[PDB]
């Protein structure tokens, strides 16, 4: 049968790819960074405790100015915090209270949110009248929205639970490009610093690197063993890290096209919800289901510290653009800032 | 001097935002959100339609907001998603109750309903949420039992030795076979709830009273009991 021949060809191609990757791995990251001195005991403290949310916080996103941030809760609100003064700038009620994601535009002009309504709503913050109102209702996804990131004021990449990603032209409200190839619900999405590429981790234990312009999957990484919930690009853009239900963080390299290091501990058995690198990429903060966020040595895989204090499951994580602080939101409707 | 004015404006805006937030919380904490789950043939649509017709109210969610005895309610059915639910089911980890609907007259797909109930009950996040079990389509179950063409023991070998429980209500004009089948299905669903509940959450089975308002009353009573038990547990008295 033709299906058997196609499956055999796919297996042969996978074997060839694995053989090439094995031949390409002449050493390991641990075997090379063994001579560098470890980071000292990392101790962050809760500088601010942003409170005012009703239900569990599901996502957050820092601003480019590294002062304002936006968070989305499951009670149907979008609160924009002035992190320096703990004040609230905006509180946008949402048509659907089931919201899984939120984003901050690089210019700070708009915000985006989405969820079980399968719609990416975009709200204009700095309008003429000063009242935040929905500007575009991006529809076309047949699954829940899980992540959204602004390319610029007129473009946004959204990942959905219909196993497809998309690039939206906000002005026309239409899908410029569709990224298909995932066999499971896409859960995370991370833009490269150059914005020309992005990665997405789905519930099929695979992360695919996509091309924004051409709309094709350049590379696929299959080092995990469970659904991938988080993904974050390295500051260099040549690597990224992933979190998964199998209680492991894994660093993949784009040029080597294979996994470089794993960050797991015997006593850690809960899933990972959010990951984010430091400004220099030396630290890898990762939220967990055990209400704790662990700081990992991105070069030596030593757990440098722990950010304890959240009463419920940590769900979102984010490091400012200048690396000044890291903000963690969890399911007890509380946001915290650490440095 | 600009900084002082900017900070004063920020504080005033934050005060307005917090006032609106507390006004919204006063309503959010007084509203009960119920998540409707089931199968294609379970019959959630008729329940939603009856509850909307009895009390006037109300894409990817079949939202419905109504008011029953000056108590706010919110019934939503998650349609339009894919068959995989292990990720979006985590949103409803703070709902008041889960209204699980079963087709009692469909023996072929009864094990699928049992497996779905087991998965919902044993979920890590859905482990503190009580389930209101709705055993729909009782007239069809009675017709199937009385016909005799299809036997429960064909799909469930444990029905041969099953006996009607002592605490069974003898509805007027009820054949012993019909009530035996009803209570066998109810006990099959209750074993999963009692096997791992450990008092964190409860199950409230209810054979549908044909097409009557009694189902809405049962939902209201179950929600009231859940709220009472939640208050007792928060006070440390249960």
């Amino acid at each position, epitope marked *: 049968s033709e299906l058997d021949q196609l*499956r055999q060809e796919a297996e042969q191609l996978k074997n060839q790819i694995r053989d090439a990757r094995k031949a390409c791995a002449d050493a390991t990251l641990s075997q090379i960074t063994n001579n560098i001195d470890p980071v000292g005991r990392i101790q962050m403290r809760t500088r601010r405790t942003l409170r005012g949310h009703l239900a569990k916080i599901y996502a957050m996103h820092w601003g480019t100015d590294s002062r304002l941030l936006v968070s989305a809760s499951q009670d149907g609100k979008l609160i924009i915090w002035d992190s320096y003064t703990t004040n609230k700038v905006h509180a946008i009620p949402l048509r659907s209270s089931w919201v899984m994601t939120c984003a901050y535009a690089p210019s700070g002009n708009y915000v985006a949110c989405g969820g079980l309504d399968n719609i990416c709503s975009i709200y204009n913050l700095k309008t003429r009248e000063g009242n935040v109102r929905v500007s575009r209702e991006l529809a076309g996804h047949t699954g829940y929205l899980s992540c959204c990131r602004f390319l610029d004021d007129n473009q946004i990449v959204t990942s959905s639970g219909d196993t497809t990603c998309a690039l939206w032209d906000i002005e026309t409200g239409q899908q410029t490009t569709t990224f298909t190839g995932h*066999t*499971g619900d896409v859960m995370s999405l991370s833009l490269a610093p150059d914005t020309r590429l992005f990665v997405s981790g789905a*519930c*099929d*234990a*695979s992360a695919k690197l996509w091309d924004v312009r051409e709309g094709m999957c350049r590379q696929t990484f*299959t080092g995990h*063993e*469970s*659904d991938i919930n988080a993904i974050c690009f390295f500051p260099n853009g040549n690597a990224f890290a992933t979190g998964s*239900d*199998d*209680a492991t963080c894994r660093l993949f390299d784009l040029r080597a096209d294979q996994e470089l290091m794993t960050y797991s501990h015997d006593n850690i*058995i809960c*899933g990972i919800t959010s990951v984010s690198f430091s400004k220099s990429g030396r630290l890898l903060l990762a939220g967990y289901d055990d209400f704790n966020c662990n700081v990992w040595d991105a070069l030596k895989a030593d757990r440098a510290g722990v950010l304890a204090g959240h009463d419920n499951r940590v769900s979102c994580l984010g490091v400012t653009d200048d690396g000044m602080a890291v903000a963690t939101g969890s399911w007890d409707s509380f946001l915290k800032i650490w440095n | 001097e600009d900084q002082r004015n900017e900070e004063k404006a920020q504080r005033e805006a934050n005060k307005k935002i917090e006032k609106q937030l507390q006004k919204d919380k006063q309503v959010y904490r007084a509203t009960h959100r119920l998540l409707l789950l089931g199968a294609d043939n379970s019959g959630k649509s008729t329940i939603v339609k009856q509850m909307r017709i009895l009390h006037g109210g109300s894409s990817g969610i079949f939202e419905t907001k109504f008011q029953v005895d000056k108590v706010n309610f919110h019934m939503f059915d998650v349609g339009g998603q*894919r*068959d*995989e*639910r*292990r990720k979006w*089911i985590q949103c409803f980890n703070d709902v008041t109750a889960i209204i699980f609907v079963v087709d009692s007259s469909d023996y072929n797909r009864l*094990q*699928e309903a049992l*497996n779905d109930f*087991k*998965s*919902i*009950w*044993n*979920n*890590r996040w859905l482990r503190t949420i009580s389930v209101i079990l709705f055993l729909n389509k009782q007239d069809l179950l009675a017709e199937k039992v009385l016909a005799g063409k299809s036997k429960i023991e064909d*799909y*469930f*070998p*444990e029905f041969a030795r099953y006996t009607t429980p002592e605490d069974a209500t003898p509805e007027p004009g009820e054949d012993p076979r019909v009530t035996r089948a009803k209570y066998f299905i109810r006990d099959e669903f209750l074993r999963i709830s009692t096997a*791992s509940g450990d008092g964190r959450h409860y199950c409230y089975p209810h054979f549908t009273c044909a097409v009557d308002t009694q189902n809405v009353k049962f939902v209201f009573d179950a929600v009231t009991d859940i709220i009472i038990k939640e208050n007792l547990k928060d006070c440390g008295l249960f």
Partner: nanobody
Amino acid sequence: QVQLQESGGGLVQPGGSLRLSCAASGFTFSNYKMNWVRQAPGKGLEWVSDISQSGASISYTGSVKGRFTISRDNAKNTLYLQMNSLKPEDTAVYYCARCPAPFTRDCFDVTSTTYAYRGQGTQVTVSS
């Protein structure tokens, strides 16, 4: 990558016997609860059996209880399903499934039309 390969299916006369295997690779076997699923022609995917990580907890469907036996061996990373007293309606494609997350009692989306942690399946046919 997570990969499950099944074997053992084939022609079996009614009242015969069979044994299925599931060579699991790409993940630690002793951390996940395993499953067996089948798909009869013209019918949807139907759960058959499951087994705990250590093999202590085992459950089947009503139509296969007393005929099918599920077992696992964490040393060889394989899952077995011995099938006895086969009947013609058992003709189906049998898939070896895995729970999505480790250390988890409940199992979600095992019988979905698409599921990443599922094998290609082996056709089992029963006819005299």
